[PDB]
Amino acid sequence: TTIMAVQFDGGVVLGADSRTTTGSYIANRVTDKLTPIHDRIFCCRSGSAADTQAVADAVTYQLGFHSIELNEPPLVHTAASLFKEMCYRYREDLMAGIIIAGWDPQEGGQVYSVPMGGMMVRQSFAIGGSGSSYIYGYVDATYREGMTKEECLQFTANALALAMERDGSSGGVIRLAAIAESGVERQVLLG
Amino acid sequence: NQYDNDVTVWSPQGRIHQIEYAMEAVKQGSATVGLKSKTHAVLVALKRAQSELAAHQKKILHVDNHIGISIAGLTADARLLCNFMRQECLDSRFVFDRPLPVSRLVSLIGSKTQIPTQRYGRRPYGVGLLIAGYDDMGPHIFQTCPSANYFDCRAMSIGARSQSARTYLERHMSEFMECNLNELVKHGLRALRETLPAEQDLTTKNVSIGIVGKDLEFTIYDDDDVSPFLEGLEERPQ
Amino acid sequence: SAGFDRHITIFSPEGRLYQVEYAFKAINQGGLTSVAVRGKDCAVIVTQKKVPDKLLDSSTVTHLFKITENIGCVMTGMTADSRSQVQRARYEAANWKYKYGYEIPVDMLCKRIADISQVYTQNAEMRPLGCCMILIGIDEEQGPQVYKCDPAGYYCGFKATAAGVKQTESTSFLEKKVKKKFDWTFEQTVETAITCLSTVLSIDFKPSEIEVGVVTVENPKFRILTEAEIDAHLVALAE
Amino acid sequence: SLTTFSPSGKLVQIEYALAAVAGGAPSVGIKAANGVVLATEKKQKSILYDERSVHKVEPITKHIGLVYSGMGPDYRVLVHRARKLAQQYYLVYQEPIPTAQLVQRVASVMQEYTQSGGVRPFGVSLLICGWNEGRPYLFQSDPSGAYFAWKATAMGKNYVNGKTFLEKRYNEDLELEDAIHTAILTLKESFEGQMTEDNIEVGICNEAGFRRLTPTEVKDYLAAIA
Amino acid sequence: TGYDLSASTFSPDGRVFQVEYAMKAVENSSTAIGIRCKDGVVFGVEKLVLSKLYEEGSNKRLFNVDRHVGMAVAGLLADARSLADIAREEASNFRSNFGYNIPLKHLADRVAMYVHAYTLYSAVRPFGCSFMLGSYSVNDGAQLYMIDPSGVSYGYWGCAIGKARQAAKTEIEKLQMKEMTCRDIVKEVAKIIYIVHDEVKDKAFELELSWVGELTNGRHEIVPKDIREEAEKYAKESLK
Amino acid sequence: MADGGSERADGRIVKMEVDYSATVDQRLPECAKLAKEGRLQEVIETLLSLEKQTRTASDMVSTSRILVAVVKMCYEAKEWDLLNENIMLLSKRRSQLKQAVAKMVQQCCTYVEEITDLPIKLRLIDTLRMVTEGKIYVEIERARLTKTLATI
């Protein structure tokens, strides 16, 4: 449910809960909610599941085919435009809370947000999910422009901690992802 | 010469002769002359008949409030491109609610006539368009060809024996630019009276004049506002 | 013979068709040579360039086309057929990746490209894409692979592989060379590729004319060598 | 081309495809009492080629074998068609397709390509076999759409000579091993002198199912079988 | 001489004679060259008036495809117009689908596939055009490509299309092409075009010069050639 | 190049006179790449001629003075690598070899008479290469006749 992406100077840092529920019963307790597309670009999803999974698979197809034909590493804004087109074309049928982030060689770390409608915007931080309203309450209080990697990790840790603590649908376990020029760093925290 | 049957075949000298044959089919039309001043564009054509008693086959036809075309060659393709012309005019007149600039219309004419010149199954259009119009920048006199290589000029003339007309246009294209409507039109028929053999003279019923002006709507004339245009002449220098 | 003037793709008497065996030397109008070698856990492509002009560039004369991140290829013959075949290969590899969820093995790709060329051959009113394609790639549980795809749609794949202009001679040298049972310790492969092209063409030239594409089971990514290390291998075989 | 008959004769473009079949690589196939043996003759041109990539003997289901004598590039096409068709039968009836119904439908496909007028026929003759309902079968087809039923036959180079050996050597009653013995005999009659574990490629059809033999047991058996 | 009718058929020696005949169709066309500098690409076309019937400003072979890409066509003009429309359409799809400027390699490959697709089948003929494609980008530099009638598309520093294809590049290649900015290259192309065919077979010609690079900040347009008037005051000094 | 070999030659004229034949090792890639460049007709052949004649002087000072048969094999390996980076199809650049080996077998003439016949016959088995693989020439192989007469 609750997904989060914060950029910093070197790269970006993502994060999500897992706890995919249906109604009042938890169907699955732990989920890879964030999805690799390319080796340097992620997307994290919310809303309905099958919609975002099918969209992410087709975007993975188109983006991999395009970036192999260029024989160059892809852009992040490219993947954001692809998600924008596929979200906007079937807004009558899809429910996507897709948030695009990823480091780029030309443009560094970027974070794009695509909410349930199909608009595309560049932000420095993003929320997402039904239990994101709360950390959206204080993400304009605790955030400071120009963090380090560890400050972003501690920040999103406190964020997703309180989101999992407060919302009934949110919960489960904390997954993090750190994307920079150096590498891709995933980890599983609790606290 | 056994390669010289279809549009698709390139020649071993590279000149597709179906295009040349369509050019020669254009060369057997009636004579017509179009020329512009800085403010008024005038195109004048020549009529013919099947017999004495019958009426004359018309050449200047209307298109739009500021567009009029002359013609030479086939008439089915003439009316086909006429209907397409009127259609594309009223299309942009509907959508953009403005009169069309002439250059994009003639680019659409070239793109229209491109397809029957490249695929198999249509003939190149035997057509002799002389187009007069008004965009924001004044009169334009364009001509086409069956090879769709449309030209812009300041004074052209196509049809049968139209080369003496071109010599007259050479020796008066400097003089064309300054004058008003009346002597401009009589320069046009001082091209048409050399598009004819010398033993007969241009009468009323065989000539046609279409003026479009920067404030004047495109209008065709026949014999009655042409009886004013036919006086003001001398004889040929015999 | 003909007689029938072999204008379309039909069967002539006794018994062949002449369109495809005219397409087999559309490679020969390329004026170009390609050699592939599989000895061991590596695989090496080598192919020269024919650039007479100083106004012409050097990066965009590349024939090694990285199909996917683990599959490379090289092309000979006419250029348009080759590049269109390459984009068909990329599109169908991406189609594999979309449909089946994992990276395509190099065998199925050659099968699919051969089938496309056969459909272009089976139905008439299309030119049969007169270019030849050599592929390389690493597969788990099978090691490296080297394959060849024909304009006819006859794929095959084998140890020491060569196609282009002068490759009766190249396969004569590769029969006279792949008959001794030594191992092929990757510089044995690079040395035998450079020297087989150096005995077929007999030029013994700068490091700036040939292109070397390698793939190895230590880095399964396809890799194109640089002028420095090409020069290093060339003087390493210089005795 | 393919749309009009001759003044008196036959369909010259099908006769030429049959000639291209007869100009192909030899093969032999024998129906015995319990099983059917197929055997081809697969020579590489050089010493460079690998024998694990291209396969002549090819299964259609788990109990239906199929070889050819012609062109692999068309062979694979009509193989894939027969695959999809047999799986469609098994979708419809939930039962493994009988070989007669396979030969009907494959013959319908080949016949549809012999129809007018832009596509060429296949240069492929099949040898279809399978063990349906106890009694095994053997069905040869051709580019013309026709089909037959054999006890033992051959196709390729010197099929006439191999067939005259088959008429003398073979009979009605054998087992699978004696069938393989006479099959490698009649293929060794016409093939080149160097016949190894890779120049031949043999699959059988027991009633327990189709079985495509390995180079291990092929080299064990043809290590001077007589 | 035996079989050169269809564009699908091969020859007894293995080439398509339709493509050769279409290649030497552009040989009779007007001479068009191009050259890039270290911060831009310069076009130049020897254009001829028929006799006295033109208007000096009609049917300009210097098209303008994208915001930073234009053509320098030579050959059959209407086929080049249609191909320019196809190139505008392809740049339109790319701008609509990815939100940034088309790289010239990808554009050239799509155009080469389109030309090759018109060379393939038997219903249609190959194109009778040969054109130039230039570009500039802040992260890519200057790129000048080249498409033959067959569909072979690769890159150059300088080129020539027309009668004097060799006779231009004989003295194109003696230019110190790297160390010059394009504002010198303007009068350089002027002198190169002015060298070939002053009066010999025809009567008179006329010069057009297109212009893209860093000095236009990534734009592509024709020069104000009347501004700095660089041909004639040097063309009259290039006859001696 | 033309100047590319002129520099090497015009410089090394004393680099080996009294200075040791280590500037040779400092000039081996020099002559190597000079031959590699290889002007069509005569220029780089004249350069290589000057180079191999300086090398004949070096033979006089090392292979004809110290007679190590290891410095002889070193000069032969130098020319060997040089011909490894050179076609020599009688391609107007062979004076690097023809008169070089001519003076080499004249050195041999002075050797069998002066040096022990074993080092000179090693030089001879290397001259076997030099001609039998290096496009055997009549008078060079007349020297071969007299050198197998020397083996006699």
Domains parsed from chain C with CATH numbers: 1-239 (3.60.20.10)
Quick check: C204 and F87 CB within 8 A?
A: yes
Chain C: list its partners (3+ Cβ pairs within 8 Å).
A, D, E, F
- Residue burial D10-19, b: 16+ Cβ < 10 Å; e: rest: ebebbbbbbb
Q: What are the CB-based long-range contacts (under 8 Å, 24+) for B79-85?
A: B80/B125, B81/B109, B81/B112, B81/B113, B81/B125, B81/B127, B81/B129, B84/B112, B85/B109
Count other Cβ atoms within 10 Å, centred on residue B178.
Answer: 10
Cβ proximity of B210 and B186 under 8 Å: no
Cβ proximity of B89 and B63 under 8 Å: yes
Pick the residue of E96, E97, E139 with the most A CBs within 10 A to test the interface with A by mutation. E97
The terminus-to-terminus CA distance of chain C in angstroms comes to 53
Per the structure block, which two tokens stand in for E63?
């098209």
How far does the CA of residue C65 sit from the closest CA of chain E (Å)? 14
List C-alpha distances in Å: A12 to A84, A133, A185. Answer: 21, 21, 11
Q: Going by beta carbons, is chain E in contact with chain B, meaning 3 or more pairs sit under 8 Å apart?
A: yes
Quick check: C98 and A60 CB within 8 A?
A: yes
Cβ proximity of A97 and A129 under 8 Å: yes
- The region that residue B123 occupies, defined by phi over 0 for left and psi between -120 and 50 for alpha, beta otherwise, is beta
In total, chain E counts a number of residues equal to 240
CATH code for the domain of E81? 3.60.20.10
C204–chain F Cβ distance below 8 A for any pair: yes
Per the structure block, which two tokens stand in for C15?
């018994």
Looking at the 3D structure of chain E, how many domains does it have?
A: 1
**Residue-by-residue DSSP string for B74-113:** -SHHHHHHHHHHHHHHHHHHHHT-SPPPHHHHHHHHHHHH
Name the maximum alpha-carbon separation found in chain E: 57
Chain E residues in contact with chain A using a Cβ-Cβ cutoff of 8 Å: 97-100, 103, 106, 139
C-alpha closest to that of E105 among E140, E63, E64, E65: E140
What residue type is E30 in one-letter code?
S
Quick check: E99 and A77 CB within 8 A?
A: yes
Looking at the 3D structure of chain B, how many domains does it have?
A: 1
Q: Which chain E residues are Cβ-neighbours of A77 within 8 angstroms?
A: 99-100
Per the structure block, which two tokens stand in for D220?
């064990």
Q: Which of B12, B110, B152 sits opposite E81 (nearest CB)?
A: B110
Q: Going by beta carbons, is chain C in contact with chain A, meaning 3 or more pairs sit under 8 Å apart?
A: yes
Give the method of determination.
cryo-EM
Helices (H), A8-143: 49-70, 76-89, 135-142
Q: Which chain E residues are Cβ-neighbours of C126 within 8 angstroms?
A: 8, 120-122
Cβ proximity of B176 and B184 under 8 Å: yes
> Which residues does residue D202 pair with via DSSP β-bridges, in sequence order?
D39
What is chain E's alpha carbon radius of gyration, rounded to the nearest angstrom? 18
Q: If residue A157 lies in a helix (H) or strand (E), which one and from where to where?
A: helix A149-166
Quick check: D77 and C179 CB within 8 A?
A: no
Q: In this complex, how many residue pairs, one in chain C and one in chain E, have their CB atoms less than 8 Å apart? A: 86
Quick check: A77 and E100 CB within 8 A?
A: yes
Q: Which chain C residues are Cβ-neighbours of D20 within 8 angstroms?
A: 11, 15-16
What span, in angstroms and rounded, lies between the C-alpha atoms of C33 and E18? 27
Quick check: C204 and F85 CB within 8 A?
A: yes
3-state secondary structure of C86: helix
Per the structure block, which two tokens stand in for A126?
């993003």
Quick check: E24 and B14 CB within 8 A?
A: yes
Quick check: C238 and F84 CB within 8 A?
A: yes
Q: How far is CA E59 from the centre of its chain?
A: 15
DSSP annotation of D166: H
Pick the residue of F28, F76, F85, F88 with the most C CBs within 10 A to test the interface with C by mutation. F85
Chain C residues in contact with chain A using a Cβ-Cβ cutoff of 8 Å: 66-69, 87, 90-91, 93-94, 97-98
The number of CA neighbours under 13 Å toward the Cβ of A143 is 17
Pick the residue of D50, D75, D157 with the most C CBs within 10 A to test the interface with C by mutation. D50
- In chain F, which residue's Cα lies nearest the Cα of C237? F84
Q: Going by beta carbons, is chain A in contact with chain B, meaning 3 or more pairs sit under 8 Å apart?
A: no
Quick check: E81 and B114 CB within 8 A?
A: yes
How far does the CA of residue F91 sit from the closest CA of chain C (Å)? 13
Q: Which of E21, E52, E126 sits opposite B12 (nearest CB)?
A: E21
Quick check: D19 and C13 CB within 8 A?
A: yes
How far does the CA of residue C98 sit from the closest CA of chain A (Å)? 5
* Catalytic-residue membership of A142: no
Torsion of CA E208, E213, E218, E220, to 10 degrees: 10
**Residue-by-residue DSSP string for E103-125:** PHHHHHHHHHHHHHHHHHSSSSP
Q: How far is CA A39 from the centre of its chain?
A: 15
Give C99-118 as a 3 state SS string.
HHCCCCCHHHHHHHHHHHHH
What span, in angstroms and rounded, lies between the C-alpha atoms of C154 and C135? 14
What residue type is E176 in one-letter code?
Q
For residue E59, give every residue at least 6 positions away whose Cβ sits within 8 Å of its Cβ, in sequence order, or none.
B149, B150, B151, B152, E77
For residue F20, give every residue at least 6 positions away whose Cβ sits within 8 Å of its Cβ, in sequence order, or none.
none
Q: Which of E98, E103, E106 sits opposite A78 (nearest CB)?
A: E98
Chain A: list its partners (3+ Cβ pairs within 8 Å).
C, E
Q: Which domains does chain D have, with CATH numbers?
A: 1-226 (3.60.20.10)
Quick check: E53 and B110 CB within 8 A?
A: no
Give the active site residue among A1, A2, A31, A156.
Answer: A1
What span, in angstroms and rounded, lies between the C-alpha atoms of E123 and B8? 8
F7–chain C Cβ distance below 8 A for any pair: no
Helices (H), chain F: 2-11, 28-37, 43-58, 70-84, 98-112, 117-128, 138-151
The terminus-to-terminus CA distance of chain D in angstroms comes to 50
Q: In this complex, how many residue pairs, one in chain A and one in chain C, have their CB atoms less than 8 Å apart? A: 21
Quick check: C239 and F85 CB within 8 A?
A: no
Cβ proximity of A185 and A103 under 8 Å: no
Chain C residues in contact with chain E using a Cβ-Cβ cutoff of 8 Å: 5-8, 19, 22-23, 25-26, 28-29, 53-57, 60-61, 78-81, 83-84, 87, 124-127, 130
What span, in angstroms and rounded, lies between the C-alpha atoms of C77 and C164? 7
3-state secondary structure of E10: coil
Resolution of this structure in Å: 5.7
Q: If residue E141 lies in a helix (H) or strand (E), which one and from where to where?
A: strand E141-147
Count other Cβ atoms within 10 Å, centred on residue F86.
Answer: 22
Q: Which chain C residues are Cβ-neighbours of D46 within 8 angstroms?
A: 171, 175
Q: Which of E98, E103, E106 sits opposite A81 (nearest CB)?
A: E98
CATH code for the domain of B166? 3.60.20.10
How far does the CA of residue C207 sit from the closest CA of chain A (Å)? 24
Count other Cβ atoms within 10 Å, centred on residue C103.
Answer: 17
Q: Which of E24, E82, E124 sits opposite B111 (nearest CB)?
A: E82
C-alpha closest to that of B220 among B229, B228, B230, B211: B211
Torsion of CA D147, D153, D156, D162, to 10 degrees: -150
Per the structure block, which two tokens stand in for A24?
């009042």
Q: Which domains does chain A have, with CATH numbers?
A: 1-191 (3.60.20.10)
- In chain C, which residue's Cα lies nearest the Cα of A68? C68
Q: Which of C23, C80, C87 sits opposite E150 (nearest CB)?
A: C80
Give the domain range for residue B32.
Answer: 1-238
Question: In A, residues 10-49, which contact C (CB 8 Å cutoff)?
Answer: none
Give the domain range for residue E198.
Answer: 1-240
- In chain E, which residue's Cα lies nearest the Cα of A105? E139
Per the structure block, which two tokens stand in for E214?
């860093």
Chain F: list its partners (3+ Cβ pairs within 8 Å).
C
How far does the CA of residue D33 sit from the closest CA of chain C (Å)? 37
- The region that residue D74 occupies, defined by phi over 0 for left and psi between -120 and 50 for alpha, beta otherwise, is alpha
How far does the CA of residue A77 sit from the closest CA of chain E (Å)? 8
- C137 preceded by cis ω (within 30°)? no
List C-alpha distances in Å: F97 to C44, E190, F13, F53. Answer: 36, 52, 20, 11
What span, in angstroms and rounded, lies between the C-alpha atoms of E37 and F135? 49
Helices (H), chain D: 12-22, 72-93, 99-114, 159-169, 176-188, 215-221
F81–chain C Cβ distance below 8 A for any pair: yes
What span, in angstroms and rounded, lies between the C-alpha atoms of F53 and D176? 82
What span, in angstroms and rounded, lies between the C-alpha atoms of F142 and F145? 5
